[PDB]
């Protein structure tokens, strides 16, 4: 019973404690490749590595390493690629991962700059006229269009494998309004952003896994994935009441470490699922009842 738990935990102020218990129980698997000295420069963070077992292997015989993990939610029937914000030398690898994994959507939960610092490189072209060519990986990236809404931007990018003369359309979902500190006070904008991602077909099993990133690819990306998977299971199970966000979270941490970085992000995910479930579970009156909330013109 999740509404219960939220109130019960908030009233008692045991968020850190509930959270820390999840940290303590979190799985732990080797990250051998990630720690190899030749991949030091592919890791934005030394303390944030993909497990060897779920890491995404680039299909280059060169060095197949990218700080990216495959989160496969078996019961939820959805896979996500959680990755760090590309570094300046790993932007070609990122797009190569996108390409080789058949990903249709890329979900960015951060801004290139946050807290006065760079949390991710400018890995996509800001201008239609200034396409980017990834020479190391031989990919061409072109901004086709963008749709700037108040809390997110949906971009239509064109990824061209220059080697095969083959082109794909990549939808870029960029939640631009996540605050520098703390989480959104309401899950409204995140959830509406989540539903457009879903609505685009980017998360369908017909495509490769959606590529979700933030700066380290664990906190906000974990929020996105946890919330989306918990929403999948509720509106799938005999009783939605049976979905346990902590167990969902722990199954996700089997695939990538540290998903959800603060007790506030864990609380934000409980908020998000609690609110997301209300709207879909049975308010026949709406589906997307995030008018004023997300505002929209």
């Amino acid at each position: 019973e999740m509404e219960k738990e939220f109130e019960q935990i908030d009233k008692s102020g045991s968020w850190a404690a509930i959270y820390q218990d999840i940290r303590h129980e979190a799985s732990d698997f080797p990250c051998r490749v990630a720690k190899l000295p030749k991949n030091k420069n592919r890791n934005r963070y030394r303390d944030v590595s993909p497990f060897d077992h779920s890491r995404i292997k680039l299909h280059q015989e060169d060095n197949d390493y990218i700080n990216a993990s495959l989160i496969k939610m078996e019961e939820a029937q959805r896979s996500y690629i959680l990755t760090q914000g590309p570094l300046p030398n790993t932007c070609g690898h990122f797009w190569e991962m996108v390409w080789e994994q058949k990903s249709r959507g890329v979900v960015m939960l951060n801004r290139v700059m946050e807290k006065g610092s760079l949390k991710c490189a400018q890995y996509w072209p800001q201008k239609e006229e200034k396409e980017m060519i990834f020479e190391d990986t031989n990919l061409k990236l072109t901004l086709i269009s963008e749709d700037i809404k108040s809390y997110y931007t949906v971009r239509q990018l064109e990824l061209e494998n220059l080697t095969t003369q083959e082109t794909r359309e990549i939808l870029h979902f960029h939640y631009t309004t996540w605050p520098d500190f703390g989480v959104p006070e309401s899950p409204a904008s995140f959830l509406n952003f989540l539903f457009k991602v879903r609505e685009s077909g980017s998360l369908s099993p017909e495509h490769g896994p959606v590529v979700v990133h933030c700066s380290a690819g664990i906190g906000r990306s974990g929020t996105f994935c946890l919330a989306d998977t918990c929403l999948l299971l509720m509106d799938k199970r005999k009783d939605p009441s049976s979905v346990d966000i902590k167990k969902v979270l722990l199954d996700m941490r089997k695939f990538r470490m540290g998903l959800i970085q603060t007790a506030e992000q864990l609380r934000f995910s409980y908020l998000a699922v609690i609110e997301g479930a209300k709207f879909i579970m049975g308010d026949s009156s709406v589906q997307d009842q995030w008018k004023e909330l997300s505002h929209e013109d």
Binding site: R44, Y45, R46, V48, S215, G258
Partner: peptide, 6 residues
């Protein structure tokens, strides 16, 4: 504190 992360 130092560049990387937790």
């Amino acid at each position: 504190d130092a560049d990387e992360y937790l």
